Write a protein that binds this ligand. Structure first.
Ligand SMILES: [Mn+2]
Ligand SMILES: [Mn+2]
Lengths: 290, 290
């Protein structure tokens, strides 16, 4: 990996913020708010590179800090969505009251210098979609320079191109952030991973010879590949559960789940958990409550 | 509960946005961005009221959707932080280039009408801290009305009060959001709950008579009160684990943990998991890897 991007990305995010406010362009602010999310993603990816190759497994994080690439990706998409909200709000108010660009050259220079950065990125969807936002800035500046507007004249159609294309860029930016908030929140909501087929898996689980009942089947995803499947299983007292255990962990293996914890409880009052909390009053605090 | 707040809060968030942009006040935009987070929190709390009293426990969410009050609270604090970032950026640029208030009356009216809403809130820290942001708006409007500034004059000291107090309000707003991002991310990072004393708990766990080894001790928090504690425990083959199990689940009960799953594995090669994935190649995909 190479990390020599924060030096460039952070430096040009500030440049596009200053030039976006000094040059009076929402497209420049939009792109700078996109490069800020790009630097947040770079920091998250670098943090996820130091969490890996150096596990911790401490007394306060029993699973480690490997979930920081999902929390840091949902916190970056929500950050970007909130930034796009303000960009959209400032883009609708400039469609009502139009304003112009004071320095097209300062917008064009930093517009290209920042489009040339997303070409020293992937070459050597957000990264793919960050380069289109840097084309809008150079398009708007060109329209204001191959067709100038003297300070003394009123706003023409040109004052509308910048807010109109910035609204389109918010729709394009939020068309990739929206699939990311839904895909990452499902992980942090303790939902079953999308790849796992919980219908076939639970149909095969009940077909294991020697198994009498299966309850508390919790399957969730820590990170990609790491799927934890808690499971309680009742079994007749006169039969061992060794071959049953082997079958259950081989069924889960074929489903891509390798972190399987099975609690074997001995054996319609024979279908509840034999081992809830030590008191009946714990039923309020039990998950999958009885 | 009462839900007759979205009708008021959503209606006045739009009013404070329009009047904050039509009246040229960052404090009004700051408060409207705070009332937007307030309505997002109201929607999250109402969703968490319908997830409760009606559990689902489906085939795609084995723990239910009870984690939506933690994901929806981290997504609301990050949303608020990103909004405060834009508010702060527009507050530093107005400290450099000062602007004034076009309609102090429109700022004062909607300033009070929106301070009277946070008095029809708690009465019948963010809610406590939303009312201070509505005092800054009424303070700034008063200074511009008990001391007017004709359009023909340059900006005096009055043009600085609004950005200066909005910077202070961002610090106050982010002084309650920051403790919320750290407290909610620890839950979504699968970290040990703060209340649980993992030192005394793990010291008592190893002192249970009949237990030979304890590994894969995963304790995490779904929501407040619901703590799930996965655990693998080795034991001698000639001794049963019934009394040991009772002791272990009574030790966890005294620690506030009632969702305990124990995998009893039979018995320094006697201290590893007896039941990893069915193949040695799964060690890469195992959590707490061997
Ligand atoms: Mn760009
Ligand atoms: Mn308020």
């Amino acid at each position: 990996r190479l990390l020599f991007m924060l030096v460039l990305t952070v430096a040009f995010f500030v440049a596009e913020l200053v030039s976006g406010y000094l040059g009076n362009s929402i497209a420049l602010l939009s792109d700078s708010f996109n490069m800020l999310s790009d630097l947040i993603s770079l920091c998250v990816g670098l943090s996820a590179g130091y969490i890996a190759r150096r596990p911790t497994r401490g007394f306060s994080a029993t699973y480690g800090y490997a979930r920081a690439e999902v929390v840091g990706a949902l916190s970056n998409a929500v950050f970007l969505t909130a930034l796009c909200f303000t960009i959209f709000v400032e883009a609708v108010l400039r469609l009502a009251r139009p304003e112009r660009i004071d320095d097209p050259e300062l917008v064009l220079i930093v517009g290209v210098l920042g489009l040339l950065v997303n070409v020293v990125g992937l070459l050597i969807l957000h990264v793919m979609g960050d380069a289109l936002g840097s084309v809008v800035v150079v398009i708007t500046a060109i329209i204001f320079y191959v067709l100038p507007l003297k300070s003394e004249d009123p706003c023409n159609w040109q004052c509308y191109i910048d807010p109109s294309l910035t609204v389109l860029m918010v729709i394009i930016i939020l068309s990739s952030a929206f699939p990311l908030i839904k895909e990452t929140a499902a992980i942090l909501l303790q939902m079953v991973p999308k790849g796992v087929n919980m219908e076939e898996l639970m149909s095969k689980l009940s077909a294991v010879p020697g198994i009498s009942s299966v309850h508390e089947v919790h399957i969730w995803e820590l990170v990609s590949g790491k799927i934890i499947a808690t499971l309680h299983i009742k079994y007749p007292k006169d039969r061992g559960y060794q071959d049953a255990s082997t079958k259950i962990r081989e069924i889960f293996h074929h489903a891509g789940i390798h972190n399987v914890t099975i609690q074997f409880e001995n054996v319609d009052l024979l279908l509840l958990c034999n081992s809830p909390c030590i008191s009946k009053g714990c039923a309020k605090q039990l998950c999958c409550p009885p």
